[PDB]
């Protein structure tokens, strides 16, 4: 385990450790993810051009469900298809 | 003194750590700074004004085949993508 320790200023610990709660987790993870942040961008549109979840509840619930339509997307919109 | 500890994969923490030297210092002040970073101007003028004129080019390559990723020469009708 590549385990660091980073010297900080009492103050400003406070800045990134309260950030780090505030994202919704730890520092030890938030700061951690800080110095090697990179583009979730690309990672992003593609997410849901190739395989789009949508934004529905269950219906169902057995494992997985093979779908027969998302999968096949083409050029036609930015975000909706399927709402 | 505000320091606090944080666990990084090995293989990963050499990205960083290393970056730490390879810039003239030591992690505990690179990835300190990393989890305080607000910027938006260098972070586009930078990434353009290095674009042109790099540092390391080496005589040697000159066709260019797709390796590097990172450098260009001004002046010369080429194709898109980098414009």
Redesign the interface.
Same mark, same amino acid.
């Given at each position: 385990?590549?385990?660091? /320790?980073?010297?900080? /200023?009492?103050?400003?610990?406070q800045?990134?450790?309260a950030l780090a709660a505030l994202q919704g987790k730890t520092?030890?993870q938030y700061?951690?993810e800080?110095?090697?942040?990179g583009d979730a961008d690309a990672d992003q549109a593609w997410q849901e051009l190739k395989t789009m979840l949508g934004n529905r509840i269950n219906d169902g619930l057995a494992g997985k469900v093979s779908t027969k339509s998302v999968g096949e997307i083409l050029d036609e919109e930015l975000s909706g298809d399927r709402a």
């Open positions: 385990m590549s385990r660091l /320790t980073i010297d900080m /200023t009492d103050q400003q610990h800045s990134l450790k520092i030890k700061a951690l800080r110095l090697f942040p």
